[PDB]
Design a protein around this ligand. Structure first.
Ligand SMILES: CCCCCCCCCCCCCCCCCC(=O)OC[C@H](COP(=O)(O)OCCN)OC(=O)CCCCCCCCCCCCCCCCC
Ligand SMILES: CCCCCCCCCCCCCCCCCC(=O)OC[C@H](COP(=O)(O)OCCN)OC(=O)CCCCCCCCCCCCCCCCC
Ligand SMILES: CCCCCCCCCCCCCCCCCC(=O)OC[C@H](COP(=O)(O)OCCN)OC(=O)CCCCCCCCCCCCCCCCC
Ligand SMILES: CCCCCCCCCCCCCCCCCCCC
Ligand SMILES: CCCCCCCCCCCCCCCCCCCC
Ligand SMILES: CCCCCCCCCCCCCCCCCCCC
Ligand SMILES: CCCCCCCCCCCCCCCCCCCC
Lengths: 162, 100, 101, 309, 480
């Protein structure tokens, strides 16, 4: 239950590292789906079963389908960027990578030194998440519906063809 | 048996890589991809924090996070479609009309 | 840490591994053997699927705990479902979901 | 090296692999049954030999990874979605607490086969046709889950064996008739079955995504298609028709009889019910089936909370 | 806990705005009518204000583990609803000049008002996050409502990408905080610490990332660069809403978070916010020096005024009168921004199409629009902290609060930034009255003019006699 967590975390890290340093959009989305599967494996290794279930049902099964759908619709076949590839020349990526490494080392220094009994991995089932969702989190559910309705309206208003 | 610090470090690494891909990539689709990596890394951090404390609040936070991620994905891809429609180009540096 | 749960874990692992290995090995046998010689309504329907799938996941979480939430949870989910149906009726009536205008 | 935990885990491994081989062989047998009704095993073996030894050709202007990955998805998605179905007491592959949620993950991954095949087939008409097909499958996967959620509400949990045990007295086809018909429609739509076989037939700027797939990848698509309807029929049995529960016959016999009956019913409504239009399919889905699932879930919740003393 | 009927009558503004959203959506689905849907939206927002009165007839209590309703929530709910009503009134003629659908605007204004009310009542990290997103997403739609324009579409893209980055930063911050402290409530962030161990590195890191997200949302330096481009590119009623309601609601939830959290009295966070406020005041006032566009000028103005508010926030847990200082300043700044952006919207209405320019050209405005020139020079004087105006009363409040807590660097920053503000505000106010070489008739345009006239008169009278506003704000005290 720990070996699965470490191997899935390593797979997720390597997959998003390949995502941010790739040029083909479909390959980037495929490696992104691979990392989402890995992070769902991370969730299942921790006992958050419902989180992994919604990770593959929705994140790697609805949102990334929309990203792939848009990629095929706009038909990116080397529109002046696949022939340039600025993110491989060092003057574009060394600076932001240095800044990100500094932020990572600051956050990691914050993480260490914090008391840790370990993660038990006890399965928090979907019925407990459902009880909490419609119990002490009622307005969160109703206004998450309101938020998704707002997103529906704005995405229709922008993206319609006419 | 799994330390909380290791899960949080993994989430921080994913967030850092997502922000790196958000910054260094000029293409707007890859900015949206980096945004998805960042919000999913934050949701993973919330799930790890909930799983350490044994509370159901982490997965509820995950659910709210992915609802926001889906709606902002819809906005990002609709705006990407409108940009590709009116400019035939996904250039995020070129359409920069208002400046100081 | 019973023998039944570890037996089921190993059985599930063997099922997944043998299934993916069977597909991969049969593709490998196929490749190795044998001699040689757009419209924006699609975005609209995918976006609607994404949004309605997230509201579906909310109902997924609700349905497994209908007994424990009582009538108050029924009222909350009825408000949720009514907002969802109002959005669906709005999309249908203003022509978002009409495929042939 | 003799101990009965090792013996038990080897027996469960044997049960899982036996289930897997029976599923793939029943899918191949259904492929031949549909080919014939519209030695037999010798003819299937000869077909498999032809698909093995024909050259697997990849287009030069096509991505190799996506083209190779689409039939693997079309097979393995529902072939792994079968793993939650209990065919007999003590003969279930995995007793997951997520269950039909795991089935929903596999359906959501199954749409990637159509999308990947359409993109890797370097053709505008094939891309448009597969994009219409993926739009239809999304439009029916939007309510597949809720059509199952009615039964989850009645059983009170996501586990498969718990649903089967709640089907001890009355099978949920009788209370959840609308959930049953919506699940049947969405399952027949997800696996690309008739009526919704080829949505590109309504327009000549679109072509099928099965074209440019030749030989063994085409065979992967075919066998995965029939395996997908194997597991759709088995899930329909275990969610609406008692699973393995029956009065006289042994439980596996009852499950096999129900699954075979739904298999021939799917063959029959391939053979009988004609072709609707594409906009008719979209309108029917988005304007009938999803509100039907929502109203059925509300009525199910009201009935459950009414019958709670 | 469960929701009692007393909690439900405390829920009345949220429920009324949600029912208004549903009713407006169903009216759009019936028939696309601009006038009926505008009337329905303004009726729902006015009913939400009367519902605020009925909430005050009830008590103050914690309706959810998520929401807490008190006079704080009432005051911020009233400010957000007034900003939303003004946005609808200004947006009606601008939408009368529009070609496409013009009721989704009112739908989005209602949803963003709902998010503002939720941020007013927010007592939870989940509630804070959900209110921020419910403000942001309708603003994503409204900023790019004229998506055919170049400026509006790029403002929409900039706001979308940067706010998604800010929301991810904020969410990771609360993830780190929930990793440190086992509860997500406001009152329990740092509760399990003692003997001076409030400076937990993980809690400080989490609160820093939430500081990044909120400092984007409040246009604070160095997360301020988005402000003038989005303010200029957006439609003028959207600029009105984005300057008033979003800033008011997000700053209210920031104040409530820093008041309730035991980690609010941490010297590290206090010094970091002091640096952010100093930089915000100085940078906004310096950058608005050489601006010819009124909307970018008002964006840098918003940066400086939020810096003044943040200065009032730094003295939250040392003084006592910080709450009423922020309330008075926010009422004055709301009315000032409403008047200024309303004049801008009234001379940019009706809409001239995606091809025609939307420049204001304020020079010589008195010679053809004398009333709007008088209103805008009143609002420009009010934004400068000039006496006989309410913005001076808020300025004096901020100065008193900073002096009381011995924040001398911030007091000097307010003095210097007010001098720079004097320069550019009086430049605009006297450019209104010069001579211009060159470069309506409906009751809704008159309604918008009446709105800005009433805002200017309120600013003048409450600058002369600020006691009723102080009395109203002082009884709007949150739970102790
Ligand atoms: C091997 C080296 C690498 C080879 C290439 C990559 C192959 C895939 C590697 C990752 C997936 C398999 C990892 C190994 C899992 C083995 C089973 C295991 O460890 O189970 C432990 C645990 C059982 O559950 P629990 O009840 O919590 O355990 C208590 C123990 N009494 O289990 C759990 O709690 C959950 C187990 C993890 C979640 C399920 C599996 C997720 C799979 C994600 C795949 C992502 C995509 C990978 C693509 C690779 C190729 C690019
Ligand atoms: C080319 C290869 C691409 C990648 C292919 C897949 C990679 C992984 C394959 C090897 C998997 C090894 C075995 C993994 C563990 C199996 C057992 C398991 O999941 O146990 C954990 C848990 C048990 O739950 P339960 O027993 O009910 O409760 C006990 C209390 N803890 O049960 C669970 O948590 C169940 C949920 C996890 C189920 C994961 C199923 C696989 C997911 C990936 C599908 C990939 C599909 C093909 C590729 C798609 C496109 C890339
Ligand atoms: C004796 C020392 C101890 C006592 C100190 C007392 C301090 C308060 C009283 C003194 C205030 C001095 C102010 C000096 C600047 C006066 C304003 C001015 O000159 O404005 C006109 C000028 C524009 O003129 P022009 O150059 O023609 O136009 C170019 C623009 N296109 O405008 C500009 O060029 C831009 C004007 C920007 C805003 C005004 C400048 C503000 C600077 C900070 C003010 C506070 C200083 C505090 C003390 C500092 C140290 C003495
Ligand atoms: C335990 C039995 C209870 C029977 C009576 C149930 C009905 C009365 C209480 C209803 C409470 C509903 C609360 C819904 C809040 C919705 C908020 C929506 C915001 C947009
Ligand atoms: C289409 C049917 C697919 C079935 C897949 C699984 C097959 C499992 C076979 C198990 C056989 C033994 C079952 C338990 C004993 C009861 C029956 C005994 C006589 C066969
Ligand atoms: C107390 C309020 C102070 C601000 C409002 C000022 C505006 C009052 C009404 C407008 C009057 C403008 C008169 C301008 C005369 C310009 C003459 C130029 C030629 C000599
Ligand atoms: C670019 C504009 C810069 C404006 C700077 C304004 C500075 C105002 C003067 C600040 C003086 C601070 C004195 C602090 C003394 C602290 C003594 C503490 C004793 C315990």
């Amino acid at each position: 239950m720990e070996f699965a967590f470490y191997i899935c975390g390593l797979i997720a890290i390597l997959a998003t590292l390949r995502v941010i340093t790739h040029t083909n959009p479909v390959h980037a989305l495929l490696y992104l789906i691979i990392s989402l599967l890995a992070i769902s494996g991370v969730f299942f290794s921790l006992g958050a079963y419902f989180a992994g279930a919604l990770e593959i049902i929705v994140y790697a099964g609805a949102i990334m389908v929309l990203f792939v759908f848009v990629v095929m619709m706009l038909n990116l076949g080397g529109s002046e960027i696949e022939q340039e590839r600025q993110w491989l020349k060092p003057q574009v990526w060394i600076g932001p990578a240095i800044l990100s490494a500094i932020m990572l080392v600051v956050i990691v220094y914050a993480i260490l030194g914090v008391n840790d009994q370990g993660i038990d991995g006890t399965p928090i089932s979907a019925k407990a998440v459902g009880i909490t969702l419609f119990g002490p989190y009622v307005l969160a559910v109703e206004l998450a519906s309101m938020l998704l309705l707002a997103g529906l309206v704005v995405a229709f208003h922008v993206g319609r063809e006419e | 048996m799994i330390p909380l610090q290791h899960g949080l470090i993994l989430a921080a690494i994913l967030f850092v890589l997502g922000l790196t891909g958000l910054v260094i990539r000029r293409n707007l689709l890859f900015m949206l991809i980096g945004l998805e990596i960042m919000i999913n890394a934050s949701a993973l951090a919330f799930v790890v924090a909930g799983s350490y404390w044994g509370q159901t609040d982490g997965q509820v936070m995950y659910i709210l996070a992915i609802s926001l991620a889906a709606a902002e994905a819809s906005i990002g891809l609709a705006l990407l479609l409108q940009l590709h429609r009116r400019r035939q180009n996904l250039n995020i540096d070129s359409v920069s009309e208002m400046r100081g | 840490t019973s023998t039944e749960v570890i037996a089921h874990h190993w059985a599930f692992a063997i099922f997944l591994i043998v299934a993916i290995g069977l597909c991969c090995l049969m593709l490998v046998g196929g490749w190795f053997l044998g001699g040689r010689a757009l419209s924006a309504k699609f975005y609209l329907v995918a976006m609607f699927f994404v949004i309605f799938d997230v509201e579906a996941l909310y109902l997924f979480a609700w349905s497994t705990s209908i007994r424990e939430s009582g009538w108050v949870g029924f009222v909350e989910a009825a408000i949720f479902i009514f907002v969802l149906l109002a959005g669906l009726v709005y999309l249908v009536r203003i022509g978002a979901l009409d495929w042939t205008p | 090296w003799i101990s009965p935990e090792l013996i038990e885990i080897l027996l469960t491994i044997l049960k899982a692999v036996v289930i897997l081989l029976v599923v793939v062989t029943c899918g191949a047998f259904m492929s031949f049954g549909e080919r014939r009704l519209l030695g037999g095993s010798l003819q299937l073996v000869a077909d498999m030999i032809k698909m093995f030894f024909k050259e697997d050709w990849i287009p030069k202007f096509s991505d190799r990874v996506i083209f190779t990955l689409a039939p693997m998805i079309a097979f393995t998605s529902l072939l792994l979605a079968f793993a939650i179905v209990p065919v007999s007491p003590g003969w279930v592959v995995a007793d997951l607490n997520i269950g039909i949620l795991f089935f929903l993950m596999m359906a959501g991954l199954a749409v990637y086969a159509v999308l990947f095949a359409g993109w890797s087939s370097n053709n505008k008409y094939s891309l448009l046709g597969a994009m219409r097909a993926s739009a239809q499958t999304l439009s029916y996967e939007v309510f597949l889950g809720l059509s199952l959620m009615g039964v989850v509400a009645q059983a009170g949990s996501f586990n498969m064996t718990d649903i089967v045990n709640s089907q001890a007295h009355v099978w949920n086809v009788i209370p959840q008739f609308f959930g049953f018909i919506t699940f049947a429609i969405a399952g027949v739509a997800v696996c690309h079955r008739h009526p919704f076989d080829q949505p590109e037939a309504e327009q000549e700027l679109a072509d099928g995504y099965h074209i440019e797939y030749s030989g063994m990848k085409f065979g992967l698509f075919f066998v995965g298609e029939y395996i997908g309807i194997v597991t759709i029929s088995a899930l329909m049995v275990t969610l609406f028709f008692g699973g393995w529960q029956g009065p006289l016959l042994p439980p596996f016999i009852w499950f096999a009889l129900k699954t075979a009956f739904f298999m021939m019913m799917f063959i029959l409504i391939r053979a009988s019910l004609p072709r609707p239009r594409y906009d008719q399919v979209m309108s029917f889905g988005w304007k009938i089936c999803l509100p039907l699932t929502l109203i059925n879930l509300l009525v199910t919740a009201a009935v459950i909370l009414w019958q709670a003393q | 806990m469960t929701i009692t009927p007393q909690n439900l009558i405390a829920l009345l503004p949220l429920l009324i705005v949600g029912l208004t959203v549903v009713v407006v959506m169903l009216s759009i689905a019936w028939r696309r009518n601009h006038f009926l849907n505008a009337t329905l939206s303004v009726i729902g927002l006015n009913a939400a204000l009367v519902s605020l009165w009925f909430v005050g007839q009830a008590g103050a209590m914690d309706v959810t583990p998520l929401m807490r309703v008190d006079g704080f929530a009432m005051l911020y709910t009233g400010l957000v609803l007034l900003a939303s009503l003004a946005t609808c009134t200004f947006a009606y003629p601008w939408l009368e000049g529009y070609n496409d659908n013009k009721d989704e605007f009112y739908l989005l204004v209602l949803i963003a008002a709902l998010g503002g009310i939720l941020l007013a009542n927010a007592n939870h990290l989940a509630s804070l996050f959900l209110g921020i997103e419910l403000i942001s997403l309708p603003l994503f739609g409204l900023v790019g409502y004229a998506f055919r324009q170049k400026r509006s579409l790029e403002a929409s893209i900039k706001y979308t990408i940067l706010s998604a980055a800010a929301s991810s930063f904020l969410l990771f911050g609360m993830a780190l905080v929930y990793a440190q402290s086992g509860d997500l409530s406001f009152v329990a962030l740092g509760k399990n610490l003692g003997d001076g161990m409030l400076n937990e590195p993980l809690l400080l890191a989490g609160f820093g990332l939430m500081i990044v997200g909120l400092g984007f949302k409040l246009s604070l330096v160095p997360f301020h660069l988005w402000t003038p481009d989005v303010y200029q590119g957006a439609p003028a009623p959207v600029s009105t809403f984005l300057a008033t309601a979003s800033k008011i609601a997000i700053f209210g939830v920031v104040m409530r978070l820093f008041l309730y959290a035991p980690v609010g009295d941490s010297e590290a966070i206090r010094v970091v916010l002091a640096i952010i406020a100093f930089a915000s005041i100085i940078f906004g006032n310096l950058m608005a020096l050489s601006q010819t566009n009124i909307k970018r000028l008002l964006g840098y103005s918003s940066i400086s005024h939020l810096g003044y508010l943040l200065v009032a926030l730094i003295a939250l847990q040392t003084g006592e009168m910080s709450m009423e200082a922020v309330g008075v300043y926010l009422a004055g700044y709301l009315f000032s921004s409403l008047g200024a952006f309303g004049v801008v919207s009234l001379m940019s209405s009706p809409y001239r199409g995606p091809d025609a320019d939307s420049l204001f050209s304020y020079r010589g405005l008195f010679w053809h629009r004398p009333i709007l020139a008088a209103v805008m020079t009143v609002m420009m004087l009010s934004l400068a902290g000039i006496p006989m105006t309410l913005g001076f009363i808020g300025k004096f409040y901020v100065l008193a609060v900073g002096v009381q807590a011995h924040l001398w660097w911030l007091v000097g920053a307010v003095v210097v930034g007010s001098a720079i503000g004097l320069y550019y505000y009086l430049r605009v106010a006297v450019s209104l009255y010069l001579h211009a070489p060159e470069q309506p008739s409906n009751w809704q345009y008159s309604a918008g003019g009446i709105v800005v006239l009433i805002s200017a008169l309120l600013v003048l009278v409450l600058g002369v006699w600020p006691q009723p506003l102080i009395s109203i704000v002082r009884l709007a005290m949150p739970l102790m």
